[PDB]
Amino acid sequence: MSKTRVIYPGTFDPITNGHVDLVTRASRMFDEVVVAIAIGHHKNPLFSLEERVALAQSSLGHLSNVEFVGFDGLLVNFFKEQKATAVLRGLRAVSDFEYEFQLANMNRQLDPHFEAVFLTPSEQYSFISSTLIREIARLKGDVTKFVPQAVVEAFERKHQQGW
Numbered sequence: 209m210s211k212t213r214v215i216y217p218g219t220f221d222p223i224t225n226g227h228v229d230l231v232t233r234a235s236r237m238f239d240e241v242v243v244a245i246a247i248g249h250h251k252n253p254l255f256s257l258e259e260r261v262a263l264a265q266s267s268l269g270h271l272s273n274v275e276f277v278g279f280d281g282l283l284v285n286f287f288k289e290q291k292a293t294a295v296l297r298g299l300r301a302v303s304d305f306e307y308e309f310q311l312a313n314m315n316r317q318l319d320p321h322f323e324a325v326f327l328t329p330s331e332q333y334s335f336i337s338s339t340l341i342r343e344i345a346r347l348k349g350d351v352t353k354f355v356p357q358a359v360v361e362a363f364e365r366k367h368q369q370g371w
């Protein structure tokens with residue numbers, strides 16, 4: 209037969225309950241799921257790689273078939289390196305759908321073995337993005353409903369260093 213491996217790439221800055229839903233769902237359909245955190249040298253995350261991985265491990269580590277790894281560079285090279293079956297993305301909105309369709313096609317031209325599968329969020333996570341969460345935290349709003357508890361605490365230990 210064979211054994212399947214999907215990469216879920218993102219900045220996860222921070223992880224949200226949305227991402228958690230998607231990884232859980234994906235872990236039911238594939239043998240190995242790789243949560244791949246883009247380091248993002250030229251992109252300026254709020255949380256470091258180390259915080260980002262830690263918060264991820266903290267929310268999804270209870271799934272036996274999920275790994276966590278930082279990467280930079282070209283997704284397709286990461287894809288080959290990781291001997292992956294497919295990439296997983298979530299599609300929240302029309303712009304997501306437009307972007308990811310283009311990207312899939314581009315990656316298939318860079319690597320004929322490339323593959324993208326997509327999941328749609330349940331309605332209770334449809335409105336959640338990392339960006340929105342950062343903005344709400346920044347303005348001292350309460351993000352508890354939308355993110356795992358560790359992430360709440362992480363926001364505080366930044367508001368506590370000052371932010």
Ligand SMILES: CC(C)(COP(=O)(O)OP(=O)(O)OC[C@H]1O[C@@H](n2cnc3c(N)ncnc32)[C@H](O)[C@@H]1O)[C@@H](O)C(=O)NCCC(=O)NCCS
Pocket residue numbers: 217218219220221224225226227230246281282283284296297298299300304311315328329333334335336337338339
């Ligand atoms: C796509 C990049 C920028 C990272 O993505 P992003 O910044 O969206 O990460 P984020 O963690 O916010 O989202 C993760 C993924 O799950 C989806 N998602 C986010 N929130 C939710 C939610 N609540 N419900 C469902 N899905 C969601 C997103 O749409 C996204 O596809 C990254 O893959 C990348 O750029 N890789 C390398 C660069 C590259 O090779 N570029 C050019 C050729 S590809």
Ligand SMILES: [Cl-]
Pocket residue numbers: 219221338339
């Ligand atoms: Cl982002």
Ligand SMILES: [Mg+2]
Pocket residue numbers: 336337338339
């Ligand atoms: Mg997001």
